[PDB]
Amino acid sequence: RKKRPEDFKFGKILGEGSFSTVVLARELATSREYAIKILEKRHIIKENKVPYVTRERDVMSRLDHPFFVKLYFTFQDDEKLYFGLSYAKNGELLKYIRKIGSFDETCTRFYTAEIVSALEYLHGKGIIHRDLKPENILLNEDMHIQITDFGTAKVLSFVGTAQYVSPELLTEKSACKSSDLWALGCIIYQLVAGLPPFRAGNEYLIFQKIIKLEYDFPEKFFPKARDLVEKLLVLDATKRLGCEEMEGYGPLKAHPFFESVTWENLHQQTPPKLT
Template structure:
């Protein structure tokens, strides 16, 4: 088992037909419904389906049974950064600088997409087999009004800063019920960097109440072995004013990356968007395994039925797109690199006006009266697309 959360557990699982290992997140349907977590679960799936960055955990497929919902996530064999800190007591400054830089690069991408993670901590920073950071657990993610992602139509952008996250990493503004901002994640980054270098969180105490008192009072003490650059950066990341934290202020991430602590880091080596490298993943599942089917969970609304990263095949070039099927019904093409809508495929219930032709498990065409759209699905779900689209005909 990899870990246990408030309404889920994560286990190491191997797909029998391919031998591929996944981190399988298992969520109890009854608990999700009882605790009003349906919107959180739906949002996490939709967000992970659209994020594409080497520093963000990858979602491969989802399915369900009578009692549970399942997420097949990228398996990070290096474990949690938290465990590495505990094993070593504390990390060297060079190690901490490398990991912090990878978190900064991934956070910049997440924030640029208009998302606030709201639970950055060493337990949610996973390590790949070759030692690179992946930000995981988007169960508390909050989209801003400026989000570039396709989000659920009923998503709320309330002004109140809903109390989520882990006590030791919660910023003072959350305790004062201020609106959520990107600065929330920057504060948590500061706490995480402090923990890397010291072995414990900066506001650690005997109870959550005492932790909160220390956070509000900004009772911050630095160990003697911290370098001046590390002290200065953490001091700035843990500024009481969210807008003054580097990465969240008017200078954006430039101010954070230019800090002397990161001297020697070549930011150009960090890629903003990863190329699709999961073509070898075999995810041939029937219709009941292609999504959560949350419409079967009491109280859930059906909005996005199916969403996949595909290659749109054209005569001269192939373009990566995100194809989204909603229950309106509607087919939408999105540019995944810019999170911008590229157009709709005209819907019709008449098979003479719109039809789906499958060449093989990876290739299919959607033909309309005026145009033919050719797609390649690296996850081998062409037949699922055909079934899903045709299921909305003449309902």
């Protein structure tokens, strides 16, 4: 029942990573479109990444939620490994933030809720993404989010994108659930302000602001959203809304900014129009 390269009509490159290339592929017998992640075995081996590739497949394989990419299958030929992944039609969240510049409160509210909900699920299974950002949050045909990219996930080292790096990661080489929550704080900021909270000339300078908590809120910034962001962007990883020392996701979803949200079925509501 194993699929082979010939079973697909390959197309366009959807993503080009360091140890990987994602190509759009159309399954011939079903007509279905998949995002097929391709990897060269020699390269992975030559690069000592077997543990990374292995962990990525396993984590994804244990995922069964609508706000997450799905691993539909896997096969390999002599030279390459193929991961049949969930195809997110409307691309990256980042794409939209740039197109319309900034999100209004309703859109920010809805999409942020889906990310909390997605994370609440992820952390429930003991998995940490630890490289969460708008580029990893895709949008399917219906404009609902689809988080992808688990090449850096952990299961309860590394370091994700500079702008979203957690303080403790720069201080103690540590990384916990609360670490994904810091990224969340950054993304919300970025959704409302239109830019990530910590920006600098170089990585070294970005990290400096991070550990110093050097950032400012625009006067426009939605108040309740500003209040939430402040309770996520806390240097102490034990005091971020959502981590277990703060008693988890219950408090976080009760935050005034989500007052209006019905958490029960986000996945089935129809997304607010991006304007």
